[PDB]
Amino acid sequence: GAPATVTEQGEDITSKKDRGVLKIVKRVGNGEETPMIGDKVYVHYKGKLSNGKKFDSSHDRNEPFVFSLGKGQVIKAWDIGVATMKKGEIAHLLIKPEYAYGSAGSLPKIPSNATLFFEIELLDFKGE
Numbered sequence: 456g457a458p459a460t461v462t463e464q465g466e467d468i469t470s471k472k473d474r475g476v477l478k479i480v481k482r483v484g485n486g487e488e489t490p491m492i493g494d495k496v497y498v499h500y501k502g503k504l505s506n507g508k509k510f511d512s513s514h515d516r517n518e519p520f521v522f523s524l525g526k527g528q529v530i531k532a533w534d535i536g537v538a539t540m541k542k543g544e545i546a547h548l549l550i551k552p553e554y555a556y557g558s559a560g561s562l563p564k565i566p567s568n569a570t571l572f573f574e575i576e577l578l579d580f581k582g583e
């Protein structure tokens with residue numbers, strides 16, 4: 456499955472190298488440029504618990520997910536992950552709880568100490 460493929464082949468993109476966030480590029484993007492801290496980014500995503508439950512998709516709303524990178528508007532794993540991405544890229548991330556919702560979780564949807572999986576498509580990004 457896609458999550459197990461990330462376990463096996465994913466690059467560790469954490470600074471501590473604790474395998475907290477693992478990444479595979481599934482479709483290559485355009486150019487060399489990746490977003491800077493403070494850039495406005497536009498993505499589509501599909502997310503689930505590592506074991507398959509709680510599937511959630513922005514495509515639901517025909518509606519890009521928009522946020523400012525590196526401002527702590529999203530879980531740590533997304534600030535780390537999206538910053539590695541090029542415009543047009545689709546990546547898979549597997550995320551240990553320390554980089555997500557931790558021991559608190561977000562009940563009942565996300566349990567204590569949950570590993571998450573996302574497929575993220577970076578549509579565009581623009582400066583502050």
Ligand SMILES: COc1ccc(CC[C@@H](OC(=O)[C@@H]2CCCCN2C(=O)[C@H](C)c2ccc(Cl)s2)c2cccc(OCC(=O)O)c2)cc1OC
Nearest residue numbers: 502503504509510511520527528529530531533555556571
């Ligand atoms: C800095 O740390 C945080 C910052 C924000 C949050 C809140 C959750 C955040 O969610 C997330 O950071 C991740 C990654 C972005 C897409 C949604 N996220 C999810 O986990 C979703 C809920 C999942 C989908 C399937 C899963 Cl299983 S988990 C989120 C959800 C919905 C909207 C939003 O911004 C704009 C608004 O308020 O309208 C932001 C949680 C944080 O830490 C635990």
